[PDB]
């Protein structure tokens, strides 16, 4: 009765560790692209247009139809829909690095997707939630969070690019140091997520939601790859586009759900972003292993 709270110690630690992860991953990845190739990919919107069209025309529609045909409740359908309309993430960049893709297309694709999310999230949210949500959902959108995510994506990559271009020697040392610190932050994130999933087992969720969260990333990957192939794209550009379409951001969904509904209405969905990220990581690792095995053979 006195405390009434006290869940801060682990959540803030996880947030700061993930922020350090993102900063250092962008640092280590900004030495793998060139500014000239970035503007070459930007001036030609073939990849950008396909990625944006897929992410904002098929993923929201896929989430909506999955929620409608899977007989999901209002809160579960809202969660899956907000996850569907979210922009791409940086796991997409990491996977593209590990899938031998065009990293000059990855950063431009992610930045354009995030800006288009700032522009289009209220629109898609209103259109697809006029049925499953009586109130307005346009206000709950975290514009400031998206803006700071854009800043945190751009600044480390920009400084890494200018460091590699001007001082090649410093690049190797900072890359090695970033890898070293990421190695420990990885075990930190792993143990924190292990505790979170251990508690999520006790506070279990709807298994239909689990099926939908498993189906969504695979459908995203397949549809992105098919759309890129049908548009006569390059071999590595196809993989980059598919891997960017498959991976979505889940922090925005958590923020929107927390703002829109009381904690007791969310309930089991407190660990939905963790489950979605776990499914994304598992399917992406499986696809990466399959691609590497095919390439070696």
């Amino acid at each position: 009765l006195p405390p009434n709270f006290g869940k801060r110690p682990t959540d803030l630690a996880l947030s700061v560790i993930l922020v350090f992860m993102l900063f250092f991953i962008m640092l280590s990845l900004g030495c793998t692209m060139e500014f000239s190739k970035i503007k070459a990919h930007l001036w030609k919107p073939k990849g950008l247009a396909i990625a944006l069209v897929a992410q904002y025309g098929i993923m929201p529609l896929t989430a909506f139809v999955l929620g409608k045909v899977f007989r999901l409740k209002n809160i579960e359908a809202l969660a899956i829909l907000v996850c569907g309309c979210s922009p791409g993430g940086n796991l997409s960049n990491v996977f593209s690095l590990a899938m031998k893709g065009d990293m000059n297309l990855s950063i431009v694709m992610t930045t354009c997707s995030t800006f288009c999310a700032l522009g289009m999230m209220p629109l898609l949210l209103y259109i697809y939630s006029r049925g499953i949500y009586d109130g307005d959902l346009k206000d709950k959108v975290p514009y400031k969070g998206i803006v700071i995510s854009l800043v945190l994506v751009l600044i480390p990559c920009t400084i890494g690019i200018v460091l590699k271009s001007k001082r090649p020697q410093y690049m190797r040392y900072v890359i090695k140091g970033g890898m070293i610190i990421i190695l420990l932050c990885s075990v930190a994130v792993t143990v924190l997520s292990a505790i979170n999933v251990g508690k999520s087992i006790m506070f279990a969720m709807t298994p239909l939601l689990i099926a939908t969260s498993s189906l969504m990333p695979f459908i995203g990957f397949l549809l992105g790859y098919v759309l890129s192939a049908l548009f006569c794209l390059n071999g590595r550009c196809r993989r980059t586009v598919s891997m960017e379409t498959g991976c979505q951001n889940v922090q925005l969904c958590s923020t929107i759900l927390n703002v829109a509904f009381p904690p007791e209405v969310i309930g089991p969905l407190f660990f939905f972003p963790l489950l979605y990220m776990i499914f994304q990581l598992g399917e992406g690792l499986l696809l990466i292993a399959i691609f590497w095995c095919y390439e070696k053979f």
């Epitope: 009765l1 009434n4 709270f5 006290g6 869940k7 409740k73 209002n74 809160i75 009586d134 109130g135 206000d139 709950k140 508690k199 006790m202 506070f203 709807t206 703002v259 829109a260 009381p262 904690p263 007791e264 209405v265 309930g267 089991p268 407190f270």
Partner: antibody, heavy 122, light 107 residues
Framework: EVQLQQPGAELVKPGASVKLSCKTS????????MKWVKQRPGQGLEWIGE????????NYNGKFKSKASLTVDKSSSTAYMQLSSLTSEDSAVYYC???????????????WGLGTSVTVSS | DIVMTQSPAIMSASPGQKVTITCSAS?????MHWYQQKLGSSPKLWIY???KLALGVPARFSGSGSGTSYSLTISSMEAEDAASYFC?????????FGGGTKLEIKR
Amino acid sequence: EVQLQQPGAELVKPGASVKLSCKTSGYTFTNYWMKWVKQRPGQGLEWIGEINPSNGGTNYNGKFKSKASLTVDKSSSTAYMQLSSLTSEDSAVYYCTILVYDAYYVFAMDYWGLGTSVTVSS
Amino acid sequence: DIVMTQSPAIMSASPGQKVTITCSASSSVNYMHWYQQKLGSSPKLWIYDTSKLALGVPARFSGSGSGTSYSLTISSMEAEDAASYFCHQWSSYPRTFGGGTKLEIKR
């Protein structure tokens, strides 16, 4: 010691309007949603709506959207419900409620108000 | 909106008789919760998430069920249990309460 204070009874005339108040003390006001519940003598409990003191977001009942209107004054840490066009079927007891709920440390607790016996007089 | 029906509407039991009250919804309810109201007082949360107990609730109260059928069981009813019990869902808006079950004392 969370405590929500409400008036005892407010007699009104049919077709008029009333503004019920709920004053909170003993907890961070902008940390939990405030819900409003209606209890008619003879029927069961009904849920009117919710309001977030720190954001102002409001979910309402389908049948109480055109009748109730929740407001918040964080300066005095007070919540308000404005009832309008009060017919004879609006005589009930109105409670203001807050629910402390954590799934991290799984636990739940309620804090209700004593109620406000609104009776249309005529 | 989900409509809940609570049975029985009125009951009588002895101080020690095992008692069970049922609530059946009109649609799939993901969790169900129970509220206790003593006469001349405001309702209080009693059991949430179909199995848990709020602060101050004695260990004699338990909950069970799923789908569209849930139940509240008291093993050894005492003299301080004559009240009104309501079932409540807050997972499918709008939130709805049950009709109410009046548990009295037999003599």
